[PDB]
Design an enzyme around this catalytic site. Sequence first.
Site, PDB file in Angstrom:
ATOM      1  N   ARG A  73       0.843  -1.180   0.000  1.00 36.55           N
ATOM      2  CA  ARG A  73       0.000   0.000   0.000  1.00 36.55           C
ATOM      3  C   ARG A  73       0.887   1.241   0.000  1.00 36.55           C
ATOM      4  O   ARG A  73       1.688   1.429   0.904  1.00 36.55           O
ATOM      5  CB  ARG A  73      -0.928   0.002   1.221  1.00 36.55           C
ATOM      6  CG  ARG A  73      -1.823   1.224   1.318  1.00 36.55           C
ATOM      7  CD  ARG A  73      -2.767   1.146   2.501  1.00 36.55           C
ATOM      8  NE  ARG A  73      -3.565   2.373   2.501  1.00 36.55           N
ATOM      9  CZ  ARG A  73      -3.607   3.249   3.477  1.00 36.55           C
ATOM     10  NH1 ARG A  73      -3.170   2.918   4.667  1.00 36.55           N
ATOM     11  NH2 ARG A  73      -4.111   4.442   3.268  1.00 36.55           N
ATOM     12  N   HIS A 117      -3.484  10.820   0.840  1.00 35.93           N
ATOM     13  CA  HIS A 117      -2.905  10.640   2.155  1.00 35.93           C
ATOM     14  C   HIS A 117      -2.349  11.972   2.665  1.00 35.93           C
ATOM     15  O   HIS A 117      -1.193  12.039   3.097  1.00 35.93           O
ATOM     16  CB  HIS A 117      -1.851   9.524   2.099  1.00 35.93           C
ATOM     17  CG  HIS A 117      -1.599   8.827   3.398  1.00 35.93           C
ATOM     18  ND1 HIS A 117      -1.792   7.466   3.546  1.00 35.93           N
ATOM     19  CD2 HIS A 117      -1.236   9.277   4.607  1.00 35.93           C
ATOM     20  CE1 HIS A 117      -1.482   7.129   4.807  1.00 35.93           C
ATOM     21  NE2 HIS A 117      -1.134   8.220   5.473  1.00 35.93           N
ATOM     22  N   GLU A 162      -8.008   8.067   6.249  1.00 36.65           N
ATOM     23  CA  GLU A 162      -8.350   8.583   7.565  1.00 36.65           C
ATOM     24  C   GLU A 162      -9.032   9.941   7.454  1.00 36.65           C
ATOM     25  O   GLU A 162      -8.522  10.975   7.894  1.00 36.65           O
ATOM     26  CB  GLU A 162      -7.147   8.631   8.511  1.00 36.65           C
ATOM     27  CG  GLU A 162      -6.525   7.260   8.752  1.00 36.65           C
ATOM     28  CD  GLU A 162      -5.635   7.209   9.989  1.00 36.65           C
ATOM     29  OE1 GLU A 162      -5.269   8.241  10.471  1.00 36.65           O
ATOM     30  OE2 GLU A 162      -5.390   6.146  10.509  1.00 36.65           O
ATOM     31  N   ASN A 283      -7.784   1.319   9.509  1.00 36.19           N
ATOM     32  CA  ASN A 283      -6.511   1.530  10.194  1.00 36.19           C
ATOM     33  C   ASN A 283      -6.780   1.465  11.697  1.00 36.19           C
ATOM     34  O   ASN A 283      -7.666   2.163  12.211  1.00 36.19           O
ATOM     35  CB  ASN A 283      -5.873   2.885   9.884  1.00 36.19           C
ATOM     36  CG  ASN A 283      -5.636   3.126   8.411  1.00 36.19           C
ATOM     37  OD1 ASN A 283      -5.655   2.195   7.614  1.00 36.19           O
ATOM     38  ND2 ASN A 283      -5.264   4.357   8.073  1.00 36.19           N
ATOM     39  N   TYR A 285      -4.859   1.246  15.573  1.00 31.94           N
ATOM     40  CA  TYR A 285      -3.662   1.279  16.403  1.00 31.94           C
ATOM     41  C   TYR A 285      -3.981   0.887  17.852  1.00 31.94           C
ATOM     42  O   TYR A 285      -3.195   0.164  18.471  1.00 31.94           O
ATOM     43  CB  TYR A 285      -2.966   2.652  16.320  1.00 31.94           C
ATOM     44  CG  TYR A 285      -2.349   2.864  14.955  1.00 31.94           C
ATOM     45  CD1 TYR A 285      -1.051   2.436  14.712  1.00 31.94           C
ATOM     46  CD2 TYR A 285      -3.110   3.329  13.885  1.00 31.94           C
ATOM     47  CE1 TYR A 285      -0.474   2.562  13.464  1.00 31.94           C
ATOM     48  CE2 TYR A 285      -2.572   3.366  12.611  1.00 31.94           C
ATOM     49  CZ  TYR A 285      -1.244   3.013  12.418  1.00 31.94           C
ATOM     50  OH  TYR A 285      -0.621   3.097  11.219  1.00 31.94           O
ATOM     51  N   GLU A 336      -3.814  -0.515   7.802  1.00 27.08           N
ATOM     52  CA  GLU A 336      -2.684  -0.118   8.627  1.00 27.08           C
ATOM     53  C   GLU A 336      -2.841  -0.692  10.045  1.00 27.08           C
ATOM     54  O   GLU A 336      -3.907  -0.632  10.678  1.00 27.08           O
ATOM     55  CB  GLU A 336      -2.531   1.399   8.819  1.00 27.08           C
ATOM     56  CG  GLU A 336      -2.279   2.203   7.573  1.00 27.08           C
ATOM     57  CD  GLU A 336      -2.070   3.695   7.822  1.00 27.08           C
ATOM     58  OE1 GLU A 336      -2.232   4.466   6.844  1.00 27.08           O
ATOM     59  OE2 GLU A 336      -1.645   4.070   8.982  1.00 27.08           O
TER      60      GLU A 336
END
Length: 428
Positions: A73, A117, A162, A283, A285, A336
């Site tokens: 990606r 991005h 995002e 994504n 985290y 991600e």
Amino acid sequence: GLPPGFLFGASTASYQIEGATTEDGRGPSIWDTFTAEPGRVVDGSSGAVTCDHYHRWPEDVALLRRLGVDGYRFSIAWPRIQPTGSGPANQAGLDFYDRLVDALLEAGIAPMATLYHWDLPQALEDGGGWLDRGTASRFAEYAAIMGDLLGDRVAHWCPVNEPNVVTLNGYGEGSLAPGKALEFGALPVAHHLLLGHGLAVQALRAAGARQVGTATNHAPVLPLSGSEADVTAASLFDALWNRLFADPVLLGRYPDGIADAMPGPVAEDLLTIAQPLDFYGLNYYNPQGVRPFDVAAVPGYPTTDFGWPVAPSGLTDLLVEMTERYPQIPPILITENGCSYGMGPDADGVVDDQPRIDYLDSHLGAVADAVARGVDVRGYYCWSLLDNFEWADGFTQRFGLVHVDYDTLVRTPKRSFDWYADVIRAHR
Ligand SMILES: OC[C@H]1O[C@@H](O)[C@H](O)[C@@H](O)[C@@H]1O
Ligand SMILES: OC[C@H]1O[C@@H](O)[C@H](O)[C@@H](O)[C@@H]1O
């Protein structure tokens, strides 16, 4: 216990790795502007050079080949394609991505292209950026250009990375480019990013694209207390961070109250936003703690070098909750996941990043646990292949499978690189 044919990849972004900010007619982005301002970046750095992927991409493709990932990606720099964000494409910009994608295909890697991005051309910000509905149309035109060049070759597309970060951090509290702090005045940015998403989906399909998805940040949102203040703030944050961006795409509606706060023909726009997708990219985290609201780290967990909780169970919880909220959600790709840990090469040239191994291992296990409960997850992309420029934190936070020395530009695969390559091999 991952599905047969589960896809393993790695992820980067253009501004964070390419360098060559003034080369070959590249126009200035909002990130060129942001990083030229004193005190915006903790270490005073910029993406002027960073990993210098623009000149060193053959070496990087070869690292991906050696890693043996199924997918890579990357993001396309809009300012290399349209320096001002409108008008005819810059050939040198087109050439760079064209050649990169042909090399990925020779190496047997499925390219995943992100259109946006975060590197908006400054010329578009000068006119209002994402506050202007017209920016969604400029974005749709850019999509068509990149679809026309690459459509038959890119395996997967992610229009907007995002949109929740772009909205809240870029225009809501101003912690990232373009540094506007509108609070709830930023809600139109969300609507135009989502409108841009839907228009780009149409543009890519018309160009003959293969699979089109998303790459939206999601996190379980945990109240830090029992107070209604805190449960209501956590609910609000969940509605603003998660639902505001998933509900329109997957259900074709905004969370309660939000449609009436959005500009333009909102009902008609939601038809455009809710284009059928091939995959839903997210994504992840860590969970977000919340107490009109304040965001803080959830206590009780070990933390990465960025001070972020390591909480793999939150990924399982999220994937389960997403499937509950959106029963028709397409196959999920983790576009991600990763962690900041600062170790570099020791006296013998080894980078022993066992904490990164532990993090990635546990997250893969958390994906397997959701699969075991009937969540259809089809792949995982590690942030990042390379140590890179981490936005307002500069070079102080290293996320790479591959260490980059920013002075010599030498790449050193870390232990995690070798670990990941072994996992991928074992699974085949
Ligand atoms: O623990 C909270 C932190 O978690 C992260 O994953 C987010 O990217 C940060 O913005 C946040 O401050
Ligand atoms: O903060 C770590 C990473 O988080 C992600 O959400 C972004 O898409 C990356 O650009 C960033 O480097």
